[PDB]
Symmetry: C2
Subunit: 456 residues, 2 copies
């Protein structure tokens, strides 16, 4: 069935006349209807509408493929507007927010022929590594339904892992692509500054530049070719996003040196995660990369400064506004974890943190002239139980943060990173996305192909 | 004179007679200096001596060149002469430069105007300086600044007050006042400054020269000696750029300094974008709430007519109410100055600088609550998005710089809160440009052309509508 196949494989079936686009969509919709009650990962569907799109293309063009995503079913995170779908942030108060226009990233996927099946589940506010909302409930991991799918792009990761869609669209502010992609055993690519514009023609709330500098859009998929396809389609300037650039993609570096991050950000790692890190080092070396351990300086401040900057804003701006609109577990995750790092009410403390961010960014940029890739864990543990961050208190929330210290430094410093299905990531410099994907292909050449999960 | 051709376009007059009107190189543009060197009519050493001699005669009046490297630059010039003669090297070979105190020059001190920093001797050039020197530029020295580079009046504890060479009773502006004054006085051909709240445009306009604030990505700010770490918010609002007496010299310096350096997170490898075919121009007059003198409105109107004559479509009364834009700049900058900067350096800065910050920025600063600062950062993003959308239709904005011509030297000296608000209101066409991260060219008549991010060449092309029609910029002799 096409639910098990990559985008290239689906398109080959269509071009050979072995499947219609409508048949492909029906296969995915039927699988969703069978298993989505268990994962709760597709939270809003557009079944009739996407079948009409598929049929339209079948009738007009038949087996001739149009754009590069023609025939390919897609999952889109609730956060990214899709014309005719609701954009809620997980909140019951926003249940009536229905968008007239696609976001630019979504529009590019659809213009290329992509078939959007619906919107994917998220946590309230998209601030959580567990996709639990007031409006839709909890996303459950298709690999083990007792476990979190991660977050904030947990629904998209779950949809791709379950074979409900071929490619997903998420975003990453504090691991929000990489964490759920790894915990659901799929690829998740956080792009870097400039490449994919974040433009919502329906009117978003205005954001602090500091927060905008740390967030990037990216695809989730079961193969690197699908990651790259979606990445290339979405890349391109749009001057409605200040952060967008017309700079082209840069061809992969010849013989990049790889530095290994293990404990240098202070992360607390399970033995099983250390074993995957070691396995990935082995794979890269067998593919001819030079990989070096114990070359990075003490970077424990990097995830801390992320939490200070983000936490101060959540505690002093966001919670005061939305505390009554979010589920209690969301409020308490913010208070329990981000409350441990927030800087208090004094603007001077926040300004000092912003200076430290710049200092760390410059230090890491300088060392990445020698080590153009950093290989690191994503999470310090495999997918935890659904309740792992539910009303756990301050002490346990500090422990959770310590398990996640290989994640948010990437956001702080504005770097692209590919999460691999084994929970290890490849981080690159700004603008060096294709170098990252080349290293990803080295892992892909060595590890078994990603297979879909059947929720049970 | 007899060693040169006397071109036939000059009918009848003796060659020697014609040449007896040839002005000293202190009056010439970079192209004219280079033509004289290439013809064998001047050596580089001669050019440098002419400038250093003029500085020695008149710099006690302007106080604009604050730290010279006379012996060193003379050695550079002699070395280039001895090796290469009348053959030009790089595109800036033979051209004397002024560099703002802020930007490292190897063997000079970077002080921020503060006597405590008189021992900060830099071993290396900043990247921007290095690029100018590698192209052949001859750095004469460092130029004057205000304490902390936060003032539209270049007054320091270390060097005293820069005075306007066009009228010594008036301010030269700031914070790049020394460089504007050096260029206006004919002490150097090109100056290098920076612009956080008008710090190039204001002194350039008040000194009657061109000043170009470049935009995001183009010129890297890299100090190999180790600068202080800065808030990204402040970094997003500041850009380096040249000050000169012609647009060719602006463009030459800009092109030399442009190029990626990954030691500056804001630097981009993006190339220059060719000028837009037929950009529409929007006129900013009172839409940011500025209080404008009649004389400034007359220059704005004159410039509209020059642009229309060149073929630009120029529209008035098309901008929305943008009075919040300069206010948000003052809120963001002021809060950092009052809650971070002054607590650390108040004892090291001159009282008039501290009092300018309290009197003016204290009117806008947000207090100690981080929530208020975060709110202002959101508003900055909102305004930026709004203006970016408008600038898809109006790719250039024509605006005053200051609301008045160069004020008296004491215009911001211990003036108090109410007078400081009035001064801010006169300057409201200035700092919105910084807030939103936009390039802008200030013309010598105190009017500016603002463009979108990455659109520097479109701006310079529009500036040439003025240069084609206006009298050439002439140097002033301080008296």
């Amino acid at each position: 069935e096409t639910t098990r196949l990559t985008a290239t494989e689906i398109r080959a079936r269509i071009s050979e006349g072995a499947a219609s686009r409508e048949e492909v969509v029906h296969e995915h919709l039927d699988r969703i209807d069978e298993f989505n009650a268990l994962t709760n990962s597709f939270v809003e569907l557009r079944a009739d509408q996407v079948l009409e799109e598929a049929r339209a293309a079948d009738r007009e063009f038949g087996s001739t493929l149009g754009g590069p995503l023609d025939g390919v079913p897609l999952s889109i995170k609730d956060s990214y507007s899709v014309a005719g779908l609701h954009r809620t942030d997980g909140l019951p108060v926003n249940a009536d927010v229905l968008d007239a226009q696609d976001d630019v990233a979504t529009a590019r996927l659809r213009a290329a022929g992509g078939l959007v099946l619906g919107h994917a589940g998220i946590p309230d506010l998209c601030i959580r590594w567990n996709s639990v909302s007031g409006l839709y409930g909890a996303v459950r991991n298709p690999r083990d339904l007792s476990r979190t799918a991660g977050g904030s792009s947990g629904g998209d990761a779950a949809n791709v892992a379950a074979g409900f869609a071929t490619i997903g669209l998420g975003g990453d502010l504090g691991g929000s692509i990489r964490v759920p992609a790894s915990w659901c055993g799929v690829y998740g690519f956080r792009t870097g500054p400039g490449r994919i514009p974040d433009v919502n023609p329906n009117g978003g709330r205005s954001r602090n530049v500091v927060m905008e500098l740390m967030a990037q859009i990216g695809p989730i998929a079961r193969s690197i070719d699908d990651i790259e396809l979606a990445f290339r389609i979405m890349t391109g300037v749009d001057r409605r996003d200040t952060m967008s650039s017309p700079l082209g993609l840069i061809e992969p570096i010849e013989a990049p040196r790889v530095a290994v991050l293990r404990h240098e950000t202070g992360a607390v790692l399970d033995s099983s995660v250390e074993e995957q890190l070691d396995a990935t080092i082995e794979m890269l070396r067998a593919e001819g990369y030079v990989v070096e351990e114990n070359v990075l300086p003490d970077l424990h401040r990097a995830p801390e400064v992320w939490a200070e900057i983000v936490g101060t804003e959540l505690i002093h701006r966001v919670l005061p506004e939305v505390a009554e609109l979010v589920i209690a577990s969301e409020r308490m995750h913010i208070v329990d974890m981000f409350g441990a790092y927030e800087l208090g009410a004094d603007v001077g403390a926040y300004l000092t943190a912003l200076e430290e961010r710049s200092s760390i960014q410059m230090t890491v940029a300088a060392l990445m002239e020698r080590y153009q890739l950093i290989l690191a864990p994503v999470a310090g543990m495999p997918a935890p139980p659904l309740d792992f961050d539910d009303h756990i208190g301050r002490e346990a929330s500090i422990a959770l943060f310590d398990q996640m210290r290989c994640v948010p430094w990437v956001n702080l410093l504005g770097l692209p990173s590919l999460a691999l299905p084994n929970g290890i990531q490849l981080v690159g410099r700004k603008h060096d996305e294709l170098t990252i994907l080349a290293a990803g292909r080295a892992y892909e050449r060595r590890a078994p192909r990603v297979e879909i999960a059947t929720p049970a």
